[PDB]
Design an enzyme around this catalytic site. Structure first.
Site, PDB file in Angstrom:
ATOM      1  N   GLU A   1      -7.876 -21.193  11.666  1.00 35.47           N
ATOM      2  CA  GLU A   1      -7.193 -21.987  12.667  1.00 35.47           C
ATOM      3  C   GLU A   1      -8.184 -23.091  13.045  1.00 35.47           C
ATOM      4  OE1 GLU A   1      -4.977 -20.536  16.060  1.00 35.47           O
ATOM      5  OE2 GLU A   1      -5.234 -22.552  16.917  1.00 35.47           O
TER       6      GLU A   1
ATOM      7  N   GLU B   1      -1.988 -23.444  13.186  1.00 39.14           N
ATOM      8  CA  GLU B   1      -2.430 -24.702  13.802  1.00 39.14           C
ATOM      9  C   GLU B   1      -3.683 -25.320  13.173  1.00 39.14           C
ATOM     10  OE1 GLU B   1      -2.267 -22.950  17.965  1.00 39.14           O
ATOM     11  OE2 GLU B   1      -0.627 -24.426  18.211  1.00 39.14           O
TER      12      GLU B   1
ATOM     13  N   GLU C   1       6.643 -18.631  16.582  1.00 40.40           N
ATOM     14  CA  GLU C   1       6.338 -18.337  17.979  1.00 40.40           C
ATOM     15  C   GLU C   1       7.485 -18.930  18.807  1.00 40.40           C
ATOM     16  OE1 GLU C   1       1.556 -19.230  17.023  1.00 40.40           O
ATOM     17  OE2 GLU C   1       2.368 -20.009  18.996  1.00 40.40           O
TER      18      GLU C   1
ATOM     19  N   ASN D   1     -12.957 -24.343  30.349  1.00 43.69           N
ATOM     20  CA  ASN D   1     -12.117 -23.161  30.006  1.00 43.69           C
ATOM     21  C   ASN D   1     -10.643 -23.523  30.204  1.00 43.69           C
ATOM     22  OD1 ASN D   1     -10.899 -22.280  32.753  1.00 43.69           O
ATOM     23  ND2 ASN D   1     -13.106 -22.721  33.064  1.00 43.69           N
TER      24      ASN D   1
HETATM   25 MG   LIG Z   1     -10.448 -26.620  31.996  1.00 44.99          MG
HETATM   26 MG   LIG Z   2      -4.135 -22.876  18.838  1.00 42.26          MG
END
Ligand SMILES: [Mg+2]
Ligand SMILES: [Mg+2]
Ligand SMILES: [Mg+2]
Ligand SMILES: [Mg+2]
Ligand SMILES: [Mg+2]
Ligand SMILES: [Mg+2]
Ligand SMILES: [Mg+2]
Ligand SMILES: [Mg+2]
Ligand code: NA
Ligand code: NA
Ligand code: NA
Ligand code: NA
Ligand code: NA
Ligand code: NA
Ligand code: NA
Ligand code: NA
EC number: 3.2.1.23
Lengths: 1011, 1011
Positions: free
Chosen positions: A404, A449, A525, A585
């Site tokens: 990926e 992806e 998905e 994050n």
């Molecule tokens: Mg962030």
């Molecule tokens: Mg991804």
């Protein structure tokens, strides 16, 4: 060399990949799948030390244990032991994008183990070590001598230790690098961890051995005959007396066998493979494998001598099934599948990415119990045991290569580059080499992806050549590229087109019929289950059932990747991105499951269960028509229970066994019923119950349900005569009404019911006010961030419009006394910056009976963003144990997610009315409610409501559920109307137009009374 | 590490492949293809030392020159300088087969060069080194510091030396390994050599530079409009002010231009390539490229700031042509090609595998002068100038990856192994990256004789994705596998099937129509030109013209791979396998060319020229119909010359301009002709002459010819009477006949004419005897060896039947005196171990005119193998300077290889009547001869003959032409009948049945007289 910064070196000295081996030296143990003494686990206690970079590891570590190391359990992710932090990043790489380099500060895990081997292993044969999973790359030494190196965190890396072994104590030293060039291919949306996280073992094989074996099953037109063909390869010295026998077993009965000496057919001008042989076994009327009936046989592969001595044996479970695409349809055993799938990451809240049997089993049981029949290994090959369980319990599996590269710009930068073809190739080839004999695997996937690059095309072709038995799919680059046999989009909507440039996501119905298209379509998905989501799930199901070529999809995803942290008190709580100091994050984006990390279901799970039922029903008169969606099994462990109730009151019920062939129908004529001229709506509920326990369900398991309204008898009777008349007391500031020991107070400045008393007991903590907003759901927020607002998100739209801040200007507040009541009329305008967003017009009618009837007529400006809800709210003084209501339930349900809820009388403890989403938001709503009871209060009408100890304000301002605190009293939100929750994705507005509150004028009415 | 024993490491620190760069800093120099000051050659004198293994190289060598080193020219193959022996092995690997290991004794070539670098190159930008060809693997050090490593002997390896060099003097050190894991993919049938055998250069590029560019040309339906699209990629400083301008020039005129900033279209969810740009130029009525008219444009690729500063420019020649397969046909610019191809290895008898401009030019001129229009790069990418030359002179090219693993067992052992995918990938991908913009390349090939492996499937697909403009072909595994767009067999025959298991070679006509087959068929190799061969060539051309989907083939091969060796006296001689001590070896199997190593033609070349003519003719009365096989050009440089002769005596002749459109026809009516009363056969010969010189031919070049018999006037004329009768004198041992100054002596014990006197001079050295054998041709021997006899080979069948050792037994010998003559009658039987193989009955009638008429009737046992010839032979006493004959010529011609020969009166020096094939065999035959004159003798009849200073016995006993010695007198072989020579292959009997002498009874007659 820095082999970890070079994609041309993905391993050194590594042995070839192959299917699971045990080197059994006894045929009957191999047949029975019992343990092999030639295969030992080295899992358990190891010695470990963490370093900031490989340059910091002291050479001494090679020769002897570091006194500073600790003793830790292996397998493990070191972050789980607290040596460094796990990082939760979604798309953006956790390292600077600068292929093929990685940070010079590269956390290094130094693992070692002291061990010994059986004397016989020092005497002869090949002893190899197998690391099922090491993240991301590593160097191996044995007794101080360098052995080899490996990359690909998701497949086993094996090395021959035969020449390094010695009498007595031996020592392994494994240097694991957190980051490597392999990390450029491991950009999956999940926590970024490292270590020796899957099993470690030693396998002692003979020098003349089975080095690989492939099992294929082909069939005649009606599947009444099969040929099992098994290609067997050897390593070692060829001798004329050697033979291979492949035997097929059905339980303890041998059904077929074939034996031959080595030497394959001529394949080209230089001859054939003298070191291979292919055995072909005829099998009559084979028992076919499917997720519905996972019939399995056992194939035992013996390398032996003509004269009967066994050299060694290998074996596998075999599922006879054919997977093919024909005429635009994905067929299994000639029948078209309907994939009730889920994507599933390998995640455990305490152990990180270490998988264990108990957990896998638990997940499979829950999946099956919730009508799933398929799983996608998002987005890498799984722990070996998963395949075994899927073969035996019966689930269709999509096995996906560990590739990926989501964070590249554009996404195929690496996948279109030939220089990365080698590293990618191994991630695809080694996966097929390992997993090709599992019947549960029905489709191979090239990764996830990674855009669409020529490397994909080459690999697609390689698999098609090597294993024609299974289709190959890949979603990158538009979901319908030359590298996929199945159109397999992620988050394409049912009716709505999202025509992004280059990679549009067409409505799935439209996609199928694009000029020239003929492939089947199965979403890799769909239905993003992030927080309060699954809105619109039924829409998918309905389309899948209507369109032959829409063959289902895999929900995103099974389980929330939340991690457990501890508070000052030692009390554990669920943590998400950034909670470990990791930055940048992607916050709560790691929680998208149908179940919480500990396997407790979210409400959305029932919705999925219901929509994925295997029996369809229609009602006509008193006849219930049951249609089987199974393709292969008869309904041999099902009974239909039916019940008729009048407004929650049981009137009649019964049972009838289901006896329906796959795809067949059964008519059940309801007995003649009773006639209650007693007003109310009669409702019929049917449920399919499995009387017998199975390997994946308990006796009594409910696998399907459905309800219908039957006859209704509108009430035409007038309520009992008004004994009394309530009194009005006026002041400039209030309107007070009294009736017996009851009082209501209406503030004339604010225009709201500000207080009520039963006796001298106050009932409200906060006045009863209109409410147009909700503490935003994850779907309402999308990727919007304070730092980086997304103005197109629902929440952003409502903030900008002032919905959260508008103030209620009073336009009118009057009181009239009537014949047997007091009528209070109010009118308010909520405005923002001069704009009137909403107007609420109400009347409160309190009569001699003590009931307060409220009528509400609201107007919403056409140009303001459609509001989240249209209702009232207040904080009651009261705190009661139970909540009883007549409406949809028992679980949380929303307008676009209530098909699974049933209309009946429910009664739960208060806390059950709260859904503990890790990231808090509006929750616990129940719709279609006609009566609600709480403490002394009773509300009646046709509304939606939630009730809990937490205010919408508190939910919206609190980022983690563990930080919520119960408020005084109870918050009641009663809605005339509530916006859908959406979920087709969680990064763009997804609530369908029909579930948006755009009517402009809304009306609702409620009666509030005590008892 | 032993990186050379690891197929997982094929290079270290090597730069990406790309099309030819020169980094011009002035656009007009780029436009003109003038030299660039930024691209320097490092060819010249280098220092070199040979070591028996890499472990023997001393460390000091990295820091300084070895005193024992020699100065040698680079590029070179060190075997050519005598450091070690070249090895000639065909299929069997030159090393033990034990992948991926090589011999520990592995000849290592230590090359070094001290050279200069100007400071300016180091002040900015990047300085790289480029090694176009290093066989087979090498390590590179610059100024004592390690730079990198490379494999693949046939493509350029480039390294950035920017950080290693310093102003002034710098020293390179290149450690070249003869054997490496790359050798397992380099098993082509050629001499096994090693060294830096292609150019070495230094290229300066700016920091912000053109890193790759691809040019494509697409057309409208009639090719009247095209769009040139050029994708350009950059590396370095990406800024908004950069632009790319691509301009297209036709000569000094700019026909089109486009300018654009960087940033390609969106390709996926992550965006597009911000470091790339595609320019699209419309071109009206483009001048199309073909091998017939190699029209070229020049595209200049300028990288520059928008305000006008040229950063650097790259450029290439562009040929507007479309290649596509449609409806089963390979079309070029919409028309179906007919490939007159040849396979060409890069071979020079003095320089080994080092190529030079002169040599390439020389080969391209001769190819074209001999009507070839295509070449296959057997079996690896060629030196870069080759492509430039085929682009400019016009030849269609099959560019082939350097992948051949013929010696594996089975042949696809490595190609079906995923662990060899990476090494193979590089060989295919880097070739395409380098040669993709050359118009001459029209087809890509995956390599040669490597069986059919899944790696081939993957790679076939990769190319098809990356370069849709050219078909991909590959012969391995049976020539019609899923890895080939073209059925491309090697040595499949025209009508005869060869049904080998798994990889049958069907007749090419039958192959096209096998159930479900639709592809075009072009032989990648056919007509094995080894020694006296090309027998049956015409059969191929007739089929090709007759079947649309039979589109030609590539002859094997262009030039013999003989090497020059020097004798004691210092005289050069042509050597083959084993002549260097090399063993095992494959002897003369390295010589299979249409031309000798010095480019002198073998006789087969004229047969290829003729069959490959571009004009076909038909004759009807006196009308000549000319048909053009050109697809795109008109015959604008051609005239038709015609001549009629009566048995060689010129009667009439003329010329007529040819004006035929491509595929058109022209009728030409010839003048009233001579109808002479005089006896003989009238013969018409027509030739197509190119009056004007071209780039590839001189004025007057003849490109085609054809002949037809016209009227024949048989002689009915009685010879006058002779005033004389021959006298006979007898003895027990002889019959002597005398007539005037002539005498004949017939031995009564042997039964042969043992001597003849003219005047009083003896005319024979050996008696006139029947001959049924020939000194065997390479095709008669095939693979047979003393050490391993192949009993099916013709030579072996003749040997075993006793043909070469059968002795004549006299059955009858009588003499009679006639009216005006003496008649001798004989009969002989040839037997072997009791079997009578052949019976020869003759009469010799000597008349009063002095002529001797010989009548011969032979019987051949039907059960003995058909004999090589049926003729007489004798050693004449005389040695004369010339040979004059009326019959086919002037070059050597055999029954199955005589279409090119024309019947006329020819006269050549004796020496021209011998063909100096390197491996000696029967040679120099001329067929269809009616009169032969040599010295005082004249022989008349209808026969085939050869005449030289070498006996058939000597030719059969000598292995190399330079060892032959002229015998006393001259050996004359006069055949009534001679077997075809074959050549469809050189390892199985290939003489077609109609060319085998199987009639059982044969009759021939000659008259031997003086003058
Ligand atoms: Mg962030
Ligand atoms: Mg991804
Ligand atoms: Mg690496
Ligand atoms: Mg190597
Ligand atoms: Mg200009
Ligand atoms: Mg300067
Ligand atoms: Mg070969
Ligand atoms: Mg030999
Ligand atoms: Na469907
Ligand atoms: Na996520
Ligand atoms: Na049942
Ligand atoms: Na919140
Ligand atoms: Na043809
Ligand atoms: Na050869
Ligand atoms: Na002409
Ligand atoms: Na010879």
């Amino acid at each position: 060399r820095r082999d970890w910064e070079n994609p041309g070196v993905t391993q050194l000295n590594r042995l070839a990949a192959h299917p699971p081996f045990a080197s059994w030296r006894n045929s009957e143990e191999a047949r029975t799948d019992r343990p092999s003494q030639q295969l030992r686990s080295l899992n358990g206690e190891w010695r470990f030390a963490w370093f900031p970079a490989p340059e910091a590891v002291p050479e001494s570590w090679l020769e002897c244990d570091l006194p500073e190391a600790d003793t830790v359990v292996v397998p493990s992710n070191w972050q789980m032991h607290g040596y460094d932090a796990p990082i939760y990043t979604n798309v953006t790489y956790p390292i600077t994008v600068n292929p093929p380099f990685v940070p010079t500060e590269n956390p290094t895990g130094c693992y070692s183990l002291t061990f010994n081997v059986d004397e016989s292993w020092l005497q002869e044969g090949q002893t190899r070590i197998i690391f099922d999973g090491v993240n991301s790359a590593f160097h191996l030494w044995c007794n101080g001598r360098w052995v080899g190196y490996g990359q690909d965190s998701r497949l086993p890396s094996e090395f021959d230790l035969s020449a390094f072994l010695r009498a007595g104590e031996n020592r392994l030293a494994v240097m694991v690098l957190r980051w490597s060039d392999g990390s450029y291919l491991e950009d999956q949306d999940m926590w970024r961890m490292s270590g020796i996280f899957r099993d470690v073992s030693l396998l002692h094989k003979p020098t003349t051995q089975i080095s690989d074996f492939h099992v294929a099953t082909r069939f005649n037109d009606d599947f009444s005959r099969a040929v099992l063909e098994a290609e067997v390869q050897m390593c070692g010295e060829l001798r004329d007396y050697l033979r291979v026998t492949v035997s097929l077993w059905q339980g303890e009965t041998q059904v077929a066998s074939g034996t031959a000496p080595f030497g394959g057919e001529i394949i080209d001008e230089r001859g054939g493979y003298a070191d291979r042989v292919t055995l072909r076994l005829n099998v009559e009327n084979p028992k076919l494998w499917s997720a519905e009936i996972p019939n399995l046989y056992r194939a035992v592969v013996e390398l032996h001598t003509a004269d009967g001595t066994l050299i060694e044996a290998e074996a596998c479970d075999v599922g006879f099934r054919e997977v093919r695409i024909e005429n635009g349809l994905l067929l299994l055993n000639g029948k078209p599948l309907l994939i009730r799938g889920v994507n599933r990451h390998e995640h455990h809240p305490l152990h990180g990415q270490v998988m264990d049997e108990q957990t896998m089993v638990q997940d499979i049981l829950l999946m099956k119990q919730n009508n799933f029949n398929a799983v996608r290994c998002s987005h890498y090959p799984n722990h070996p045991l998963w395949y075994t369980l899927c073969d035996r319990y019966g689930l269709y599996v999509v096995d996906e290569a560990n590739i990926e590269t989501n964070g590249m710009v554009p996404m195929n930068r690496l996948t279109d580059d030939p220089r990365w073809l080698p590293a990618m190739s191994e991630r695809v080839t080694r996966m097929v080499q390992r997993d090709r004999n599992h019947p549960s695997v029905i489709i191979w996937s090239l990764g996830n992806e990674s855009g669409h690059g020529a490397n994909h095309d080459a690999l697609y072709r390689w698999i098609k050549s090597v294993d024609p038995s299974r289709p190959v799919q890949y979603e990158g680059g538009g979901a319908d590229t030359t590298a996929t046999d199945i159109i397999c989009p992620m988050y394409a909507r049912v009716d709505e087109d999202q025509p992004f440039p280059a990679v549009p996501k067409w409505s799935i119905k439209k996609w199928l019929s694009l000029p020239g298209e003929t492939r089947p379509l199965i979403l890799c998905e769909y239905a993003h289950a992030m927080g309060n989501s699954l809105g619109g799930f039924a829409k998918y199901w309905q389309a899948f059932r209507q369109y032959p070529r829409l063959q289902g999809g895999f929900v995103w995803d099974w389980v929330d990747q939340s991690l457990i942290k501890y508070d000052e008190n030692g009390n554990p709580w669920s943590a998400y991105g950034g909670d470990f100091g990791d930055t940048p994050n992607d916050r709560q984006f790691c929680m998208n499951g149908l179940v919480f990390a500990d396997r407790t279901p979210h409400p959305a799970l029932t919705e999925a269960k219901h929509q994925q039922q295997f029996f369809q029903f229609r009602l006509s008169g008193q006849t219930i028509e049951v249609t089987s969606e199974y393709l292969f099994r008869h309904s041999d462990n099902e009974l239909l229970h039916w019940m008729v109730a009048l407004d929650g009151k049981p009137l009649a019920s019964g049972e009838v066994p289901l006896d329906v062939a796959p795809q067949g129908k059964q008519l059940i004529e309801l007995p003649e019923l009773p006639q209650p001229e007693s007003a109310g709506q009669l409702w019929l509920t049917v449920r399919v119950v499995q009387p017998n326990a199975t390997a994946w369900s308990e006796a009594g398991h409910i696998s399907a349900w459905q309800q219908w309204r039957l006859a209704e008898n509108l009430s035409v009777t007038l309520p009992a005569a008004s004994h009394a008349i309530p009194h009005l007391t006026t002041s400039e500031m209030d309107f007070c009404i009294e009736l017996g020991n009851k009082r209501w107070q209406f503030n004339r400045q604010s225009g709201f019911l500000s207080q009520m008393w039963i006796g001298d007991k106050k009932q409200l903590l906060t006045p009863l006010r209109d409410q147009f907003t909700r503490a935003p759901l994850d779907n309402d927020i999308g990727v919007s961030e304070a730092t980086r607002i997304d103005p197109n998100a629902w929440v952003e739209r409502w903030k900008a419009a002032g919905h959260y801040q508008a103030e209620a200007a009073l336009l009118q507040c009057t009181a009239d006394t009537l014949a047997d009541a007091v009528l209070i009329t109010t009118a308010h305008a909520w405005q923002h910056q001069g704009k009137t967003l909403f107007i609420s017009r109400k009347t409160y009618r309190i009569d001699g009976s003590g009931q307060m009837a409220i009528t509400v007529d609201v107007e919403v400006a056409s140009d303001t963003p459609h509001p989240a809800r249209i209702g009232l709210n207040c904080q009651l003084a009261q705190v009661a144990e139970r909540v009883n209501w007549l409406g949809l339930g028992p679980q949380e349900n929303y307008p676009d997610r209530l098909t699974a809820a049933c209309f009946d009388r429910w009664d739960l403890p208060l806390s059950d009315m709260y859904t503990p989403y890790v990231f808090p938001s509006e929750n616990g709503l129940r719709c279609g409610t006609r009566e609600l009871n709480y403490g002394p209060h009773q509300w009646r009408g046709d509304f939606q409501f939630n009730i809990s100890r937490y205010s919408q304000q508190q939910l919206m301002e609190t980022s983690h559920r563990h930080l919520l605190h119960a408020e005084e009293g109870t918050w009641l939100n009663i809605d005339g109307f509530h916006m859908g929750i959406g979920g087709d994705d969680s990064w763009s507005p997804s609530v369908s137009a029909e579930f948006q509150l755009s009517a402009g004028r809304y009306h609702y009415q409620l009666v509030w009374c005590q008892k």
